[PDB]
UniProtKB/Swiss-Prot annotation:
Organism taxonomic ancestry: Eukaryota, Metazoa, Chordata, Craniata, Vertebrata
Effect of residue 120 to A/G/I/L/S: Reduced CO(2) hydrase and p-nitrophenyl acetate esterase activities
Protein name as catalogued: Carbonic anhydrase 2
Site (described: Involved in the binding of some activators, including histamine and L-histidine): 91
Gene that encodes it: CA2
Effect of residue 196 to F: Normal activity
Activity response to pH changes: Optimum pH is 6-8.
Protein source organism: Homo sapiens
Length: 259
């Protein structure tokens, strides 16, 4: 069984030994150089259709926490933009720092944000998530930066349940959560082909990274930082700095949806 994480001994610089694709040609995250990304008039309008989203549960997996959705039907889907066809929401999670000056996976002109939200969707032409991650167009991840400032009211229900899932393997019922409350006003975005940012690092993702960050309060992010990577009863290792740094861009171009 694998033992990867974010520490010195098991962090991103070690992942390649068990997961050689770590050094592949389309790894994520990347730095988004805003002066090299080009506006693409071919991109169709982005469609985020979350009205019928059905959240179920929140889980501390020892790496982050996942808010999981019922994806047994097209209840919450992402379409348009660079995407061909229909991508179903399965879960969201975050990456964050020990300090407000770090935490995001993607960077913007080398700027690190305090955190990054990933809304994970799978291409319904492949039938199930497990099949989709074996395809180069299997997933679409909508990435949203978080900066510290004013509180995000739509985040507070997530913050308040974290006390109940402090340690690895703990879960809690998490019904009726509306992920629309985590979006910024603008859907302007950058897009490029990449990968999962954790093991197994599969090169199956179309990344759609929104330009406009959301603002969360210091108190909200402080509560993320009280989570634990460890299991119950084990020595405490605070769940902080669960982000992979930027990877080589290699042959890829980042396209902008906006002028
Ligand atoms: N940070 S991320 O790139 O958005 C990201 C999104 C999703 C996942 N993996 C999930 S949900 N399960 C999974 C399990 C077994 C596999 F073989 C493959 C994937 C990891 C990272
Ligand atoms: Na677009
Ligand atoms: Na915003
Ligand atoms: Zn992620």
């Amino acid at each position: 069984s694998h033992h990867w994480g974010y520490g010195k001994h098991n962090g991103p610089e070690h992942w390649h030994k068990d997961f050689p694709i770590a050094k592949g040609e389309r790894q994520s995250p990347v730095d988004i150089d805003t002066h090299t990304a080009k506006y693409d008039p071919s991109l169709k309008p982005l469609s985020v259709s979350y009205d019928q989203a059905t959240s179920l549960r929140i889980l501390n997996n020892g790496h982050a926490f996942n808010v999981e959705f019922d994806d047994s039907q097209d209840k919450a889907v992402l379409k348009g933009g660079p995407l061909d066809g229909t991508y179903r929401l399965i879960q969201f999670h975050f990456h964050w720092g020990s300090l407000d000056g770090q935490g995001s996976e993607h960077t913007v002109d080398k700027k690190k944000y305090a955190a990054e939200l990933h809304l994970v969707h799978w291409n319904t032409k492949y039938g199930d998530f497990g099949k989709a991650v074996q395809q180069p167009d299997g997933l679409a991840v909508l990435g949203i930066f978080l900066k510290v400032g004013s509180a995000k009211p739509g985040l507070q229900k997530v913050v308040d349940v974290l006390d109940s899932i402090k340690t690895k393997g703990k879960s809690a019922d998490f019904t009726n959560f509306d992920p629309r409350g985590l979006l910024p006003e603008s859907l302007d975005y950058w897009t490029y082909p990449g990968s999962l940012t954790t093991p197994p690092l599969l090169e199956c993702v179309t990344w759609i990274v929104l330009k406009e960050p959301i603002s969360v309060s210091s108190e909200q992010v402080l509560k993320f930082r009280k989570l634990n990577f460890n299991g119950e009863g084990e020595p405490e290792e605070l769940m902080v700095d669960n982000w992979r740094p930027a990877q080589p861009l290699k042959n890829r171009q980042i396209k902008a949806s906006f002028k």
